[PDB]
Structure formats: C-alpha cells, structure tokens
Design a protein around this ligand. Structure first.
Ligand SMILES: *[C@@H]1O[C@H](CO)[C@@H](O)[C@H](O)[C@H]1NC(C)=O
Ligand SMILES: *[C@@H]1O[C@H](CO)[C@@H](O)[C@H](O)[C@H]1NC(C)=O
Ligand SMILES: *[C@@H]1O[C@H](CO)[C@@H](O)[C@H](O)[C@H]1NC(C)=O
Ligand SMILES: [Mg+2]
Lengths: 651, 404, 321, 281
C-alpha cells in the first residue's frame, strides 16, 4: 500500500543541475522517512556519478523538489564516457524505508535515463550574410548558460567551407562571454554556403552553428520585388482565379527605378524542375517604378495546351515568374525570382496539431484548430464547421454539429461534449467558404474498466502572456473519492520547475504563475491515485507575446533622411550593464544574396529555449505512464516504471 | 617685347633677362602656397609660353584607404593647418601618431598611422597617406606593391618584401607632391640617424658637388661651405674615415681621391675643397650625374685592386655618398645605371646593405625632380635619404646642426 | 554648332570626393550602463543601413533589439559601379551614372583623373560633356586599358556649370588582377597508411610552360578524414623550408575533412600515419594565357555618319608650328 | 548632325540558347536615338524586334528570333552635345532566359577604331593614345631658326630624354601603328638605352590614324620622351606622339636652295653642338 514516487526528466544533461521529484503515499501520519537520491553508473560498472542529496519527507509534507547536481568530473570518473552502445544512465533513490515497510528485496528504486552532453545556449552572428571571395570575414559567438545568463565556460569554434572541409579552429577562454574573430576567404573559393560552428569545450553535442553565403558578385544599386496579387491560385474545376502580379523596382536609397521589365513565366514543380511557357513573355516600361502585368484566361489555357497539361493536373505545381529588369539609361541588370505562388484547391489551411488526443470520456473534448490563410498570415473571423460522430457506445452513433468563427490569429476552440463509454470519436473539420479546407481526424478511447480518469479544463483558451496568471480546473472522473489530494507539476525546458499539492474539493482550481522563463511552452502534468493505480493527464500550454527579460532599444535622432558623411547620434537604451553588440549592414547585401537570410531576432532565441523541451505532442495519454512519457518525465512507483525513451526525437 | 600682364595673385615674380625673347620668368608665392604655372617662357617675342597664374593653396594628400580602421574627419584633400585623427577597431593596436597635422610643406607630421594585430610574421607596413598597397598578406617572403594616386610622385620603396628578420625590405613609401619640399628641422634628425648607422672599422665618404650653369656661383659657394662643415664634423669624431671631393659637370672633375693618403687629414681636404672654382666648369656646363657616379665607381675599383679581393682591410670599408645637386641630370644616361654597378661591385645583399648609403640632397625650387632624387638615394627601413631643400640657406642650416 | 561651355565650371577642388564604401561598419561591442549615445560618422555609400543590435547582460539575460533602418541620400551623385573582374591589358568600359533628381536641367563635365597604370582615351585630360535632364539620369562611358598590374586609385569627377553649383567625385581603389586567367591543377592521391608502400609519398614539382610570371602561386591541401592520418607535408622552398602537420582525425569523427593553406614554391613531400582511407588533394593555382564574344551569341554595331568633336579630341596636325 | 546606326545580331552556338535575346546598345556620349525611326521599325510586320525602349544614350531592343545568318537592322540618331573625347562605346547582347550568357562588343565611331590603341610588345606596354606628331618643317619651308626653337624644345619643355638622327630603312604597318625601321646615324642624347650607338636599328612607330609620313631612304632628327616597349628583341623601341620633335635632314639639294642655306646650316650647327657638348644647363 505505501509507495514512493520518483519524478525526473527523461533526459539528463551533463554539467547542469537536475531536478528530481520525490513523493510518498498512504504513509502513517506520525511516520517519517530518510534517504538519499543519486545518479548511479549505467550498470556496466557500479560507481556513483553524483553527490548524494538527502530528503526529509513526512505525512504533512509528502513532496519536495530536489535540485540534484551532476558535476562533469564525477560523470567522467564513474564511467559514463566509457559507456558502450547507447548513452544511458541510471538514477536511483536509496532509502531503508522500502525494506522496513514494503519488505522489498532491495532498498533501491530507480529509473532509466538518457544522458546527453548538450548544455547552454550558444548564439553567433557573422559580419555580412554574403561575402566575395578574398574578402575578410568577421564573426563573434555568445556563451550563455541554461538561464541565458552570460557564461564563462571555454568554447571551441570552427569554420567549415562550402565543400564541408574544416578551415579553422579556436579553443578560446570566455572572460566576457563574447569572442570576436576574423579570417579571410580564399581568393579561389567557389561559390557556396560556408558554416561556422561553436561548441562548449566539455560539451560534445552542444554545437550551435551559423551559415553565410560566398558568391562572386558586385553590390547592386537597386532591388526588384515581385508581389503576386494573391499568394494562392484557385484551381477548382468550377473556376480559376485570375493571375496578376505587381512588379516593382526601386533604388535602394528610396527612389523608384526607371527602365524596362522582362518577365518570363513557367511551371515549377516540387522537385525544382521548371518548364517555361514558350510565349507569353511580357516586356513593359516601368511607370513609377512599377509594372502591373497579368496572365489572361485564354493565354494561360493555350500555354497549358502547348505543354499538353490540364487544369486538373495542376496539383502541387507552382507558377514560376522570373524578372530581369534593365535600368534605363543606366544599363544595370537586376533579377528577381518568384517561387511562392502555389496552385491550391482552397484558400485556407487547417492545423490540428494543437488538438489533444486520447481525451477522457465524460469530459468535454477541446478541438483546437489554426485557420491560417494559405502561404500567409493567420486568418481571423473565418467560420469553422466540425461534425463530431460519437461511435457506438452500445447504441446508434450520433452526429454533433458545432460552428464557431475564429476569435483571432486563427485560434478556434470548440468544446464538443463526449458521452460516457464512447468507443471512439470521428471528427471532420471544415473551414472557410466557398472551397473550404477539409481536415479529418479520428481519436480512439481509453480502455474500458480503467482505475479512473483525470480531466484538466482550461476556461480561458487565449494563450497566457508573460507574467499573467493561468488557472486550471482538475476533476477526477469515474472513481470514488478515496484519495484526499492530487499532485501537479510544471515542466519548462525539459526540467521540473514546480511541484505542489492541492486538496480535493468541488470544482477545484490550480493556479500557475506564468514566469518569463516558462515561455514559449510549458507542460502542466497533474495526477492522483485511486488505490494503487496511477491516473494522469498532461496539458500543454503555449505562451505568446514573447519579449526579453530586459530590453534593448535602438533609435536615431530625427527623421531617417541623412546625407553622406554626416553625423548620427545613435541611441541605446537598456535596463542594466549589458555587453551591447552592434552592427550596421548595407541593405544591398540582402538583394544580392541568392537566398534572403532573416537576421537574428527574439523568435530564434525563444526557439532556442524550446530546443531543450522534451515534450511529445500536445499532451494527454491513455495511461499515467503514457502521459508522463509524452510530457518528458520518468516515473517509477516501485511496481510500474516507464522505460527509457527510445529516441530523443519522439516521433 | 613680351606682354607685362604676367602678375600672380598673392605673390611676386622674377625675370632672368628682362622681357627679351628667351627670358625665363620665375613665379614665387609665400609658404603654404604653390605657384601655378611655375615658370613662363617669353618665346620668340610671342605670348608667354607655359609648360591666369594664381597661388593655389597647399593641400596635403588624403588617406585613400585605411585598412581595419576609420579616420576622422574625411576630406578629399586636407588644407594647410588641418588635422586628422586615426583610431581603429578593437583587437588592433595603433602605431604612429594618431593625430597628424598637414604642414605647409605639403607633408604630414609623425609616423604613418597603422594598427596591426601581430598574427602576421612581419609588422604591418601600412598604407601611407596618399598611397595604396596591393597584397594584404604579411607572411614571410611575401611582397607588397605601392602606387601613388592623383598627381603625386612616389618617393621611397615601390615594392617591399617581408624578410626573415621581421623587417620589410626597403623604406616606407611616402607619396609626395611635385611642389612639396623639406624643412631643415624635419630632415636634420633623419640625416643624423642615417650617419649614426654609418659610423657604427674605416669609412669611405664621397662628396659630389654640382657646378653646372643651372646652379649659380653663390649657390655653389654655399654648397662648398656645407661640404666643408660636413667634413669638419666627421673628422671631429676621431673615427677612421677617408673623404673624397668630386665636383661634376658635363664632364666630371676630381678634386681629391681616396687612393691618396691625404684624404685622412682635415687641412688637406679643406685646402682641396677651397681651391675649387667655377672657371674650370665654365667651358662645359652640363649635369652628367652618371659620370660622377662612374668616377666614384672607378675609385671603388682602384681601391679594390690596391687593397685586394679578400683582404680584411677592405671588407670593413663602408661607403657613404653625398650628392648636393639640383636634380637635372641631362646627359651621360640614367644615373641609376652607375648605382647598379656600385651595388654589384660592393656585393650588396641583405647583410652587406649597411656598407653602402647614398644621400641625394636636392636643392632649388624650379627644376628639382623627385623621381631622380628618390632613384639615386638609398632605401632603408626607418630612414630617409632623398631630400629637397628650397634654398641653400636651408642646406647650410641643416648641415650645421646635422650631427649632435 | 552645339554650344559648349568651357572653364566656366566649378573649380573641381571644392567638390567633396566620396571614398568610404564599406559593406558593413559599426562592428564594435559596447558596455551600456542603461544609457549611451554614439556619434557615428556615416559612410559615403548611398544606400539604407539596417543597424542591428544585440544585448548581453549579467542580470537581464539576453535581448535582441529591433533593427533601425537608416537612409542616406544626396539628391545628385555620380554613381559608379566597377566591373567585377578587370584583367590587366584588357579593355574595360567604366560606367559612371549621374542621377539628377533635382527639378532643373543640369550640364556636367565628366572626366577621370589621369593616373599611372591606366591608358584612358586621349591621355585622360579630356573631360566628357553630358547633360542630365531633371528627374532623370545619363550614363557616361569611359574606356580604359589598365596596364598597372596592381591596385590603383581612380577619381571620376562630375563638374556642373557655375549657374547651377553641383558636382560629385568618387574615388574607389580599382584592384587590377594580373595578366591572363586563373588555372587550377588539382592532384589526387589516395592515402592508405596501412600499406607500408604508402607511408612516404612525394608530389612532383610543378613545371608548367604556360604559367605566367608572378603567377600568384597558392597551394591548398584538401585532406579527407574518411576511413587517423597524421599527414606531415615537408617541403624545401625558395622562401624557406616550412612544414605544417595535419592531424585530421583528432580522435574524433564529425566531418573532419581538413583544408589548410600551404606555402611552397616547387617541391613537396608527404609523411603518412594512422589508419584510414583518406584522400589528399593539393590544389595549385596560377595565371595562364587562354581565350574565352560568345560562341553562341554574337553582335556587331556599325556606325556611319559625321560626329562633331569638341576641338580638343581631334588627333591631327595643328598646321602652324 | 544626324548619324545612322546599324546594330547587327546572329547566333552560332545553337546549344544552350533560348531563342529570344535582349539587345542593349549604348550610343555615343552625346547621342539619343530617334523614336520615330524605331517606331517605324517596330510597326513593320517582320520587324525583327517585338519591343523597344530608348532614353538618351541607351537603346533597348528585344530580338525574339536570332537565326543562323546575319540578319540585322539600323536606326538613325541625333547629336545633343559634341563628343568630349574620342572613344569607343559598348553594346551588350543579353540572353532572355539566361542573362548570365551574355557578351558585349566594343564598336567605334564612324571612322575611329574599335579599341584604344596601345603599343603592346613583350610583357609590358604603353598608352599609345595621345596627339599626332607634328613633323616640324622649318628649313624646308625656309623659316629661319628663332631663339633656338630646336634647342628650346630640347632643353626647356618638353625636355627630351632621347635624341638621334636616323635614316629610315623601311616603312611597314603592324596592328594600329606604322612601323618605320630606322638606322642610327648618330646618338645626340639618351637617358635610357645606354647601349645606343651609330649604325644600329631602332623601331619608330606612330598610330596609323595619323598622317605622319617618314619617307624611307631619308634621314630625320627625332627627339622626345622614352618608351617602355623594348621591341621584343632587346633594344628599346620608341613611339612618335606629341612632345616629339621630328625634322627632315638637309639633303644635297633642298639645302642648296637660296633661303635654305641659313636654315640647314643652323640645324647642322645644332646637331654638332648638342651631340658634342650637351644641353649646356
Ligand atoms: C550538431 O551536429 C550534428 C552532427 O553534425 C548535427 O546533425 C546537428 O544538427 C548539430 N546541431 C545543431 C546545429 O544544433
Ligand atoms: C528642363 O528640360 C526640359 C526638357 O528639355 C524642359 O522642358 C524644361 O523646361 C527644362 N527646365 C525645367 C526647370 O524642367
Ligand atoms: C598522430 O600524432 C599523435 C601526436 O600526439 C600521436 O600520439 C598519434 O599516435 C598519431 N596518430 C596515430 C593514429 O597513431
Ligand atoms: Mg645643372
């Protein structure tokens, strides 16, 4: 009857603290326990790999979060570096309570974990996106720990050329967490995309890299952009929407380009092979930097006929538009290419990845969809129709029809009601009209006769902001109220950050304070115990409106209309002493580049936060072990323990 | 006669033979300004022939490029009295004067600004203001080629190679303007340092004097005076040296030789120098610098024969040549040809380069050519050998304070 | 017949030349104590500068600021774009373009400053007369045969009339590549250190008849780590005896194919080690005389008529000297 | 006034081409094409170009069919300002589908040359662009020497670094220059070429566009600035341009004529004094 619970992330990262959750159950009120938890050897040999940390838990305090440290010296000495086959390790909890109470053969309870040397966040940016051969290349890397604080650990950068051969390598100490460096591209180097990689010296797998392009080019004077009238082409048999483009050419310093535009059309497939339309080439004189050309109906039909292609065959193809504008009388040539144009059967796209699977019977099913305009920003105010067909629970199936428009940014939350003893649920989601986007998903049901169920209801479907408190409702379903409390934890960046206990009540609430470090996605895992069988449910919550912990603001005094050689009073504003890194880039580099490389912004940093997340889907599971595995934890209660994850990817 | 409307704005002018045909008009402007045109010809009674006249301001060269750094303020050509500041990016330690002020002679002050990280085997030679450099690799055995810009003339080394000892071969090039000259105060320490390297054994010194028609009788008198103080000072150091006096013209004349033993006596050399006159060079008034250098080479070969091929007594013999000319070699061929013979016979290499220094002191303000003086003078790192002085007063001034 | 203005122009000395054209600047890293003002000096390039920004602080983590677009515009300039490739002794046609964005007709005399190493048209002293209508642009064609064989500074200058005091001057250093085209001589040698015969190998020295003097001889070694080579390349050289040792495997395997610049004149030797199937590719580059108007396309413009020159470009006798 | 252009186009490779091609000819410095001629050109059924656009010194033509043979078409332009300097223009022909498959052609003025004339020999060569040699005639015209005009030209400006009296063996034309192979009668002066001697060959070259004539079998006095061409044989080879003094030598009879005694005698007096004594400065 008494039990000891062991909670820990499925993957342990070397050199950074590990959070271990420990818990009791059904223990006498006056009873207390003693013990220590430590990482043991992968059992190929037997040497402890971490210092022992004590825990003192009782009836009134039956939970505690232990910050178990895993120093690199102990990991190297005990034999993790000498391991064979895969990278596993064992975490066990040692306490005489097991033998004293449960009369177990051993006083050791543990889990199987994967150990990876990846740690810290490494960011690095180069001088320019594109360079000429024989041109000096400058770059710098930033070293940051788990909490993105500046890190002083030594790092080993390297440079790989276009062919992939290493060209440079520097093992550099970190006094200021920034390492500036420069090198010269060989004058005989062929065009290609070079790569600069940076790793922590003791972290083998912590390689963060950036890429820059090398090409024989000269700086352009103006850039040409081709913007389609609509980023989609409707190819439904009933009608085909007109194809129209607005070709613009403007001098980079602002003024429009005067010249002519040479437009060549063609069909481009997914592989990349482009078949040009012989004929229909349009040449126009740019009037106010712009030329508005369009493809007619009969012209396009004849073009398809010449290639012996049908409208119904245009599935997945792309209408390829290329331009080569000649400045007049300047004579300069600049080329623009269009490849985003896609033949589609519906002007909308449905993303159902947010829809939780394996949902509990007896509680509302939260269908969540993202109505994103095809190759565009999320759409707002677009109706969504879903037909829910509850499969036979013993009677005839029933069809439930709910309609709800998109509140904003494509977010639609449709709480369909699921009856008890449901065999399986079939959903058919349709959004937009006419020519809707059809998305179909089917979900099974948990096995009948289970020990119970837990439901997590989130009244506010809008994503929480930074610093905004989030409250969830927990309700046990399908079992008696033998238990007195349930327990919940919050997972961010693959580490257990919070643990608490809430007493069982009626229509209960659990409040979670969304800290900044919990962004951009944290897992909420809650579970209770019906006798000796665990039942759990994990809800994934994403955090939007990501912003820096501090702030950095650049501003230029006055209007942005200067003259060459004049003075600029650039303004920097922040809230603390910061190693501000600056860089002024000529805009023409973006135009000359074959592929436009977006600069470093908060999106990449927040993705770097999410790169350490161990989550597997939007949460939920048939059993407690499945819920914990999807969340990214390892659970062992002495009788049932989840196996170590087969792969980090969790396909 | 020629028309009288030959006035220059802000300056004066002088005439050689009045307004008669064939007379040469000389234009002069105060310091900080350069005459333009420099001189006019009265023609065969026609309108004045030029190779409105205005004293255009002096303007120092502006940095064409500044590798791994910025320079403020940025101008096309800095005027007189202007300033330029040279600070460069992080990881690079500046060398030379960060602040350089354009002097009225058309030259900056202080060493040329350059910052080097030190990764290269040799120190960064840098881009001297007004010049450009080709080749950004400082590896051992690598080379850099310099080219002037606009209408500047290159004085110094047009090609430098990073030698094994970590010093670039040749001197640091300095793009110069045709109208630019040298102040005595600037050039006295350079001559002192070069002669200090020379005195660091027995030394052979040859003094070459100009006695053509272009140089005047008074000008040659000041040349003789400066030579006399020069030989007076070197004998005051109690160092074994032999000095020879050569005064060249269309045909060179030898007033003293190193073969004679009298060259090691102060009274003898001064008596030989004072006996010089203009009458002997009056019959032929050319400027055959090649012939003078060939006479020097003949002295070299005679000393060779009398001393010996491999005798130590000659191996420790160092040679320093001084030329007080107006830089108008117009017969006998290129004077550089005889310098090639001298370098060949002396077996000049990277090690024996200490044994040969050639000083080419130009004098005058009208017909002095920078290319000729630069070509004659020797080129060594950190030292200047080719000089131009506007007046022989400046020549006497620089010599009388030349040593310390 | 056409009216020409002479010497009533701008003095050409007041016109401010533009010479700083950096692709990127402001690469410094600054310590901001919650407030700092930087006095940046804008470069002479006429584009828009997107000034990036990243913050790294010990207490507030990391932030990336929004880039600031900064625009520089002159309203009348001589934009000049040098050709990508300029070989010595090869005729190229410089194309300075005068963009006149004002509201008045402008007459400008365009000329290239005569410099040593450039053979211009008529010695480089003549100034070409062009007129740029308001709100338009005109190109001026300068044909140059560079004989410098080294980098040289040109300064194209545009001089308007004294009635309308405008003008621009641009001074970019024009790197002159050396005579001929580049040739590549790669040499492939499979590297099996297990076989004792492959322990020591020597690459033959280069004796190429068509190699041009001052052939910028650069050697790069491309050695592949695919299977632990300790290839030590030893070589006598005119510059000196230099040997740099390559350890490709580093007791590790993540795309460790290596490339290192190798500085040799003629001779080269190999000392192998380890156990692997690596490949050595010493790459030699040098100038060569070779040729290729397209073989596919061709074009010919023939002109007949009377063209009036400006009495300063007529190459003939003055008839009175 | 009005100048008739003619732009010609054809293709030979036949492989890798896409047919339609873009013509981009740049007119002379002070010329803009007539729009009337071009619109008449494009209004014809077999116009050979589907589109055109010209502004100032630029003309754009879209050739939608480039065949094997030489088909081409011409238009007429007008002059705005006189051409400031004699110089060829550039015309470029682009490929519609692969613009990187291009190649420009240099076309000269109606009578001038295609490329800048440069006296190129050995591995270094000189800028041959400049002015015509004058071929000064004072004794032949009978004009007496004034203020030593030959001596003034030799010593004052442009100072001469080489001076010889040469007998012209032959007249030949190579590339853009007319080569006069000459034999050295005497060496008056020399800065470079220390190996000058009597009875030696020297190549004197002048641009073919000029009318300068050096009759073979006659002697002339040539003075001027050096060249850096080296003749590919070893001896420096001189070019004739501005700053070069060329005078026809006194013969048995033209110096006999009455007004010419003083002139020919004075020129020979210059000969002996300058060769023997020097510049005297
Ligand atoms: C680290 O290196 C591995 C092996 O080359 C690569 O697959 C992985 O993408 C890298 N990780 C990064 C770039 O985050
Ligand atoms: C400029 O030239 C145009 C074209 O010849 C003419 O119509 C106009 O009046 C002129 N002046 C202005 C101020 O635009
Ligand atoms: C390569 O050199 C290292 C230098 O430490 C040496 O220890 C090693 O044995 C060599 N490589 C192999 C594969 O033996
Ligand atoms: Mg003289």
């Amino acid at each position: 009857k008494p039990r000891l619970l062991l909670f820990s992330p499925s993957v342990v990262h070397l050199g950074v603290p590990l959070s271990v959750g420990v818990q009791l159950q059904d223990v006498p009120r006056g009873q207390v326990v003693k013990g220590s938890v430590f990482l043991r050897n992968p059992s190929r040999n037997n040497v402890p790999c971490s210092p022992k940390v004590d825990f003192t838990l009782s009836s009134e305090r039956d939970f505690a979060l232990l910050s178990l440290q895993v120093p690199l010296k102990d990991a190297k000495s005990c034999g993790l570096h000498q391991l064979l086959r895969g990278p596993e390790v064992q975490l066990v909890a040692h306490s005489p309570w097991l033998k004293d109470s449960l009369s177990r053969t051993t006083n050791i309870q543990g889990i199987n974990l994967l150990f990876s040397s990846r740690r810290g966040h490494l960011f690095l940016q180069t001088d320019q996106p594109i360079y000429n051969p024989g041109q000096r290349v400058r770059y710098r890397v930033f070293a940051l720990d788990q909490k993105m604080r500046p890190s002083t650990d030594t790092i080993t950068v390297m440079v790989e050329n276009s062919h992939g051969l290493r060209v440079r390598k520097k093992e550099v100490y970190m006094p200021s967490s920034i390492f500036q460096d420069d090198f010269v591209i060989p004058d005989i180097s062929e065009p290609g995309t070079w790569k600069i990689s940076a790793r922590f010296s003791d972290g083998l797998e912590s390689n963060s890299s950036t890429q820059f392009e090398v090409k024989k080019y000269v700086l352009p004077n103006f850039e040409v952009k081709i913007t389609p009238g609509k980023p989609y082409i409707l190819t439904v048999p009933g009608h085909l929407d007109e194809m129209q483009l607005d070709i613009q050419a403007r001098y980079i310093y602002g003024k429009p380009v005067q010249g002519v535009a040479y437009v060549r059309f063609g069909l481009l497939d997914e592989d990349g092979k482009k078949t040009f339309f012989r004929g229909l080439e349009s040449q126009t004189k740019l009037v106010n930097g712009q030329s508005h050309i369009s493809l007619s109906k009969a012209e396009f039909q004849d073009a398809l006929e010449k290639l012996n292609m049908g409208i119904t065959d245009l599935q997945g193809l792309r209408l390829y538009v290329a331009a080569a504008i000649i400045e007049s009388p300047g004579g300069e040539m600049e080329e623009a290419e269009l490849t985003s144009w896609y033949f589609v059967s519906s002007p909308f796209s449905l993303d159902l990845s947010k829809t939780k699977r394996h949902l509990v019977p007896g509680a509302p099913f939260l269908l969540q969809a993202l109505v994103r305009e095809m190759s565009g920003s999320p759409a707002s105010g677009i109706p969504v129709k879903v037909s829910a067909t509850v499969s036979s629970p013993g009677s005839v199936p029933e069809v439930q029809d709910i309609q709800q428009n998109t509140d904003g940014s494509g977010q639609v939350s449709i709480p369909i009601i699921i009856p008890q003893t449901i065999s399986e649920l079939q959903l058919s989601v349709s959004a937009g009209s006419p020519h809707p986007a059809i998305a179909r998903l089917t979900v099974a049901a948990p096995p009948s006769g289970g020990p119970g169920f837990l439901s997590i209801e989130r009244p506010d479907s809008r994503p929480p902001r930074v610093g905004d408190t989030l409250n969830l409702n927990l309700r046990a379903v399908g079992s008696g109220a033998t238990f007195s409390h349930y327990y919940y934890m919050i997972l961010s960046r693959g580490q257990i950050v919070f643990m608490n206990r809430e007493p069982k009540r009626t229509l209960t609430s659990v409040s979670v304070f969304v800290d900044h470090h919990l962004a951009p996605s944290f897992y909420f895992v809650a579970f209770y115990y019906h006798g000796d069988h665990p039942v759990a449910n994990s809800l994934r919550v994403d955090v939007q409106a990501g912003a820096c912990e501090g702030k950095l603001e650049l501003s230029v005094d006055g209007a942005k209309q200067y003259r060459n050689g004049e003075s600029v009073k650039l303004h920097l504003e922040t809230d603390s002493l910061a190693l501000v890194a600056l860089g002024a880039l000529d805009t023409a580099l973006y135009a000359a580049g074959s592929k436009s490389h977006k600069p470093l912004n908060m999106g990449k940093v927040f993705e770097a936060m999410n790169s350490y997340d161990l989550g597997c889907g939007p949460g939920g599971g048939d059993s407690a072990l499945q819920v914990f595995q999807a969340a990214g934890l390892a659970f062992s209660d002495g009788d049932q323990w989840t196996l170590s994850r087969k792969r980090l990817s969790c396909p | 006669s020629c028309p009288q409307n030959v006035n220059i704005s802000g300056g004066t002018f002088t005439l050689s033979h009045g307004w008669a045909p064939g007379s040469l008009l000389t234009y002069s402007c105060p310091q900080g300004l350069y005459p333009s045109p420099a001189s006019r010809l009265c023609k065969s009674s026609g309108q004045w022939q030029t190779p409105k006249a205005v004293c255009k301001p002096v303007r120092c060269p502006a940095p064409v490029s500044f590798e791994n750094g910025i320079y403020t303020p940025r101008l096309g050509s800095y005027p007189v009295g202007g300033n330029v500041s040279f600070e460069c990016e992080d990881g690079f330690i500046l060398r030379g004067s960060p602040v350089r002020q354009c002097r009225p002679n058309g030259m900056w002050d202080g060493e040329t600004a350059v910052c080097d990280n030190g990764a290269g085997h040799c120190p960064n030679p840098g881009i001297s203001l007004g010049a450009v450099r080709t080749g950004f690799r400082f590896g051992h055995g690598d080379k850099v080629r310099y080219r002037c810009s606009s209408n500047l003339v290159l004085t110094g080394s047009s090609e430098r190679e990073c030698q094994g000892n970590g010093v670039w071969s040749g001197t640091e090039p300095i793009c110069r303007q045709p109208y630019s000259y040298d102040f005595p105060e600037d050039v006295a320490p350079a001559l002192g340092t070069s002669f200090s390297h020379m005195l660091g054994g027995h030394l052979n010194l040859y003094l070459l004097l100009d006695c053509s028609q272009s140089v005047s009788e008074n000008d040659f008198l000041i040349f003789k005076e400066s030579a006399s103080l020069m030989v007076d000072r070197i004998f005051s150091f109690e160092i074994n040296v032999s000095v020879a006096i050569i005064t060249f013209a269309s045909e060179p004349k030898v007033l003293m030789s190193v073969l004679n033993d009298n060259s090691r006596d102060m009274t003898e050399v001064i008596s030989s120098l004072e006996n010089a006159n203009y009458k002997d060079h009056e019959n032929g008034t050319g400027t055959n610098t090649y012939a003078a250098l060939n006479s020097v080479y003949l002295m070299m070969n005679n000393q060779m024969r009398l001393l010996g091929m491999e005798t130590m007594a000659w191996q420790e013999i160092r040679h320093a040549i001084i030329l007080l000319t107006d830089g108008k070699s117009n017969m006998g061929g290129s004077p550089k040809t005889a310098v090639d013979h001298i370098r060949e016979i002396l077996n000049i290499n990277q090690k024996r380069n200490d044994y040969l220094d050639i000083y080419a002191i130009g004098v005058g303000k009208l017909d002095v050519d920078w290319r000729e003086l630069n070509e004659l003078g020797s080129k060594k790192d950190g030292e200047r050998h080719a000089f131009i002085l506007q007046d022989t007063k400046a020549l006497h001034q620089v010599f009388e304070h030349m040593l310390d």
